[PDB]
Structures are given as structure tokens and as C-alpha cells.
Amino acid sequence: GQLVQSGAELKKPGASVKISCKTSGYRFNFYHINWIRQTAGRGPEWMGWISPYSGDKNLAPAFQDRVIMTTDTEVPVTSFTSTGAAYMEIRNLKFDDTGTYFCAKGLLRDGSSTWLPYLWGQGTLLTV
Amino acid sequence: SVLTQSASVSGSLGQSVTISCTGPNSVCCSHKSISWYQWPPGRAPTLIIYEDNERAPGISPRFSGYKSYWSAYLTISDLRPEDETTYYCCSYTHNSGCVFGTGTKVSVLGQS
Numbered sequence: 318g319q320l321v322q323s324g325a326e327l328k329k330p331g332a333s334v335k336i337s338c339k340t341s342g343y344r345f346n347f348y349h350i351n352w353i354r355q356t357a358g359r360g361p362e363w364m365g366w367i368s369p370y371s372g373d374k375n376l377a378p379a380f381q382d383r384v385i386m387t388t389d390t391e392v393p394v395t396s397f398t399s400t401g402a403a404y405m406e407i408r409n410l411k412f413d414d415t416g417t418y419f420c421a422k423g424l425l426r427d428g429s430s431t432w433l434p435y436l437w438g439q440g441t442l443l444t445v
Numbered sequence: 446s447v448l449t450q451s452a453s454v455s456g457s458l459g460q461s462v463t464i465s466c467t468g469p470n471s472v473c474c475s476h477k478s479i480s481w482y483q484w485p486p487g488r489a490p491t492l493i494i495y496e497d498n499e500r501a502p503g504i505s506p507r508f509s510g511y512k513s514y515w516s517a518y519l520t521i522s523d524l525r526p527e528d529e530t531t532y533y534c535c536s537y538t539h540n541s542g543c544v545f546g547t548g549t550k551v552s553v554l555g556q557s
């Protein structure tokens with residue numbers, strides 16, 4: 318998978334950011350995209366679970382209406398190993414949102430253990 | 446952190462330690478699915494357990510998991526020095542998102 322994130326950014330409070338990660342070497346449609354924040358003060362918090370195959374989205378109750386997640390279409394490098402991108406838009410950042418952001422690939426395509434993150438990228442540092 | 450752990454785990458080189466992860470009846474484990482993760486603060490985590498005891502690809506059989514009606518446990522044996530990381534337990538349902546819990550440091554006493 319070798320997930321690659323956009324990279325660290327510095328920003329003034331009371332505003333919005335778009336953070337993007339580029340998948341490689343695994344079909345993008347099959348596996349869910351799982352967006353995550355690790356705030357050093359607050360520990361780990363969940364952000365979102367977007368399906369790249371349809372418009373199915375799932376979001377944590379603490380962040381309703383505050384964050385909008387979307388995905389691009391894939392590009393066929395070769396059969397069963399494509400390249401695709403996903404990004405999230407987070408409105409109205411504050412001091413509380415100063416940590417490391419990761420996106421991840423779902424574990425399985427089917428079964429009760431889907432929507433569970435397996436591969437993780439290096440991540441980006443958000444300082445606000 | 447509705448999914449509470451013990452926050453103080455230690456084991457000796459070659460012995461076996463156990464880590465617990467419990468919570469309320471609204472965010473529980475009997476009616477939920479439990480997954481376990483190795484997360485060094487600063488690095489990207491790694492999967493160990495996904496369903497409730499099933500072992501992830503690329504994990505030596507020294508790890509295992511069990512689930513009671515009120516708490517979930519992992520029993521790690523052969524504690525090499527590289528096990529000094531932090532484990533965050535995850536409670537997830539089939540049709541919803543996981544609820545990560547607090548963090549438990551693990552200490553390998555008796556190393557060199």
C-alpha cells in the first residue's frame with residue numbers, strides 16, 4: 318500500500334484545511350479509507366470511515382457537520398493494483414486539534430471485521 | 446475514554462504478561478467486537494487482533510486474545526525488549542465505527 322500523506326502544515330486558528338493521501342499498489346475501491354487523529358494531549362480520537370466504492374460515509378458523533386470527507390476515482394496502473402486518492406476537509410480548526418493525522422486501509426473487503434484499519438501512512442503534523 | 450484499561454502493565458523477559466480492557470455496558474465487549482493494536486507514540490500503529498481472538502497476518506502465535514462478558518484480555522508471552530510499546534484496545538461493531546480506548550504502557554522489567 319505504501320500510503321503517502323500530503324505533509325505537515327502550519328495554520329492560523331479559526332479556519333479550514335484539506336488533507337489528502339495518495340494510495341498506491343492496492344485497488345482503491347475495494348478497501349475503506351479510515352481517517353484518524355492522534356492529539357498528543359487527548360490521546361487517539363476517531364474521525365471518519367469513508368467507502369471509496371460508493372458514497373457511503375460514516376462519521377463519529379463528536380464531529381457531525383464539522384468535517385466533510387471525499388475521494389477521487391482510481392487510475393489503473395495494472396489489474397488488481399491501482400492508484401487512488403482520498404481527502405478530508407475539516408472546518409473551524411482550534412487549539413484542541415493539534416496532532417498527527419493518519420489515513421488507513423480497511424482490513425477486509427467482506428465480513429464483520431471490515432471498516433477496521435490495517436495499513437497506516439507516516440502522517441502529517443498539524444500545529445494550528 | 447469510555448473503553449478503560451489498567452494503564453500499568455509490566456512483565457519479565459521470557460515470562461507472560463496479560464493486558465485487560467473493560468468498560469460500561471453501553472460500550473462493552475460481549476455485544477461488541479474487540480481488536481488490538483500496537484501503537485508506539487510517534488510512529489504508525491500495527492494490527493495484532495481484529496475479530497476478537499483472530500490473529501493478524503504477520504504476527505507470531507505468541508499473541509492471543511480472549512473475551513469475557515465484561516472485559517477483554519490479551520496474553521503476551523516471550524516478552525522481547527521490543528514489546529515496551531503502548532497498546533490501545535478498540536471496540537467496533539460490524540455496521541459502525543470503532544471506539545478507541547485509553548492507553549496502557551507495557552514495561553519489560555529485567556532487560557539487560
Ligand SMILES: *[C@@H]1O[C@H](CO)[C@@H](O[C@@H]2O[C@H](CO)[C@@H](O[C@@H]3O[C@H](CO[C@H]4O[C@H](CO)[C@@H](O)[C@H](O)[C@@H]4O)[C@@H](O)[C@H](O[C@H]4O[C@H](CO)[C@@H](O)[C@H](O)[C@@H]4O)[C@@H]3O)[C@H](O)[C@H]2NC(C)=O)[C@H](O)[C@H]1NC(C)=O
Pocket residue numbers: 346347348349368369370371373374375426427428429430431539540
Ligand atoms: C464490489 O466491491 C466492494 C468493495 O469490496 C463491495 O462492497 C462491500 O460489500 C460488503 C458486503 O456487502 C460490505 O460489507 C458489509 O458492510 C455493511 C456495512 O455497511 C452498512 O452500514 C452503513 C452505515 O453507514 C450503510 O451505509 C451501508 O449501506 C450498510 O448498511 C454491513 O452491514 C455488513 O455486515 C453484514 O455482513 C457481514 C458479512 O459477514 C456480517 O458479518 C454482518 O453480521 C452483517 O450481516 C458487511 O460488513 C462492505 O462494507 C463493502 N465495502 C465497501 C468498501 O463499500 C461490493 O459489494 C462489491 N460489489 C459487487 C457487485 O460485487
